[PDB]
């Protein structure tokens, strides 16, 4: 009661939000790359410097940002992905909070450069000050968007303390990129670190062979044990791969990539199902190696549980679990 | 790009926020009760109806809310607990986002009734509409604050679906109240369900005996095996109780309450430390029963990681772990 109930300053309120969604450089990358995916992007180039604590440049060939919408794009609670409660209960895109851009820009130097197909001129935008004021200016840029985030946490001393080493932090970026490359085989992704190309995942065309990118990501060992899954029931569909438990090593058990409607996710439920399927098949229980994709009606899953979409809750919980269990158990036989 | 980048409506933006912090009735209770604690409250009465899906009434004898600050209290990003980045990096209260009240009021009928010691008159306030407009009016109320949340999720059909049974949901409230009663022995707390008193934890006076409330909460079995801990090193202090691993049952292992600066918390780090201490002491590894309290300089711990403060990150990670490990290991010998 000594201090008055007061509205938080624009920038500080955003940093608090940034703390719950922007953990480290890998997190900045996840969000910006997911924006590119939503923008219809087909080629995404990521350039990192000093593990991303120095620079994070993400360029995409997505639809781009309108000039008169550059500022809105950097505003809080501003999004083009949903406009009602209905749209929310049926999320069909990675983003929907309209919080990512303003959050990251409040703890770094974020520059947004974009051009839509209907524009001859390209534009650049960024927020500054205690109030996060936006300024828009000319710039040369092809159709699409380039995000440039510099000096992550340069203005949040405390959080900068938690940054690991260049190598470690970049390693996390690499793993996140790896996860996204597996969610969208149809998307070409290039990753560079300190001027050198670390990796490049070329797109897998219509009905093309996925195994190729699969092996390039998870390794050849995994590809040899990988058992393709195709299990469906109405609006529940399980696809992807599961390696034979009898032939899974601790090294392979590192590959436990799971997706819900194309969104990377680590859900205790799904994981429990897949494992039970391997415990009841094989003799003992152990860590399985997999890359499963669960497609489901967006009304049966709630993704508004974590500010970073790290968790989900299935309405019909038991059903979903039994579904994945059978699916996996079906292939192990 | 078809839909324009647009700012979300007041109410919908809050519901999205509510989804990340207000899981179920127990969550509403946690937040409101934590507000009472911050308000200097010494007696907190909680009344629940139909597992809290019908009504959640929390009355406290805290300092209360100023009349001209009732609206601010219900606004977004509005708080009296912090006003700068400095205040944040050194959190000394349960709340600091200024998001709890508006979030819950956007998914229920929340009525705030309060009076400060300097006011003769009491007031009542609540938000309504797509824009969350506040209205303030007369009301009779002693010094303090009463929160009344009705029809949780009445306007969010999807989330209402996830509510368990009356008994289950109330069971979660009971467990949360149990956790808070353990964090503040000096606070009298009364809990009722459907007009009947379920529990009442009376305050433990200055230096009084805690064991009494300890046994009333965790049970007598735990109290018999409980080993008091008192381990300090500078600004790191570990207090509380740990039962002998050799005499811990699966029933007792249900008691694994941990606190950081008086804030209930379940951290994998701390848990790992306590267990390692029991694995290296006893023969095998297993679930330990405990009620530990970790006090530490607010600059060594970051609590701005989860919108509901469900997680933390220690700056000097290894040190903290070794500290709790020794502390526990010290008592087991
Ligand atoms: N690379 C991009 N290309 C085109 N439009 C973009 C790009 N990145 C962002 N946008 C637009 O900017 C708006 C949002 O930025 P952002 O702040 O990330 O929120 P969001 O995507 O709406 N939801 P969330 O991620 O949950 O915060 C989006 O709604 C898009 O319309
Ligand atoms: N029971 C109460 N008694 C007195 N003041 C209260 C009470 N509950 C809330 N308030 C005041 O209302 C303001 C905030 O409500 P709330 O929306 O819960 O945010 P917060 O406590 O600031 N932070 P957070 O919980 O992280 O959102 C507080 O900052 C207090 O000043
Ligand atoms: Mg986004
Ligand atoms: Mg609060
Ligand atoms: Na935005
Ligand atoms: Na508030």
Summarize the structure in words.
Two copies of one chain form a homodimer. Chain A is α+β, with helices and mostly antiparallel strands and 333 residues long. The first copy, chain A, folds into two domains: 3-218, Heat Shock Protein 90; 219-332, Ribosomal Protein S5, domain 2 (2-Layer Sandwich). Chain A has helices at 10-21, 25-38, 70-73, 85-88, 100-105, 157-160, 166-183, 211-218, 220-225, 268-279, 317-331, and strands at residues 6-7, 43-49, 55-60, 78-79, 109-115, 122-128, 133-139, 144-150, 188-193, 196-201, 226-233, 236-243, 256-260, 263-264, 290-295, 301-302, 313-314. In chain A, the strands form three sheets. An eight-stranded mixed beta sheet of chain A has the order 7-6-5-8-3-2-9-10. In chain A, helix 2 runs parallel beside helix 7 (166-183) and helix 10 (268-279) runs parallel beside helix 11. The first copy, chain A, is globular and about 60 Å long. Chain A starts with 5 loop residues before the first strand and ends with a helix. The relative contact order of chain A is 0.13. The complex binds phosphoaminophosphonic acid-adenylate ester (ANP) (2 copies), magnesium ion (2 copies) and sodium ion (2 copies). The site of one phosphoaminophosphonic acid-adenylate ester has 21 residues of chain A, from helix 2 and helix 5.
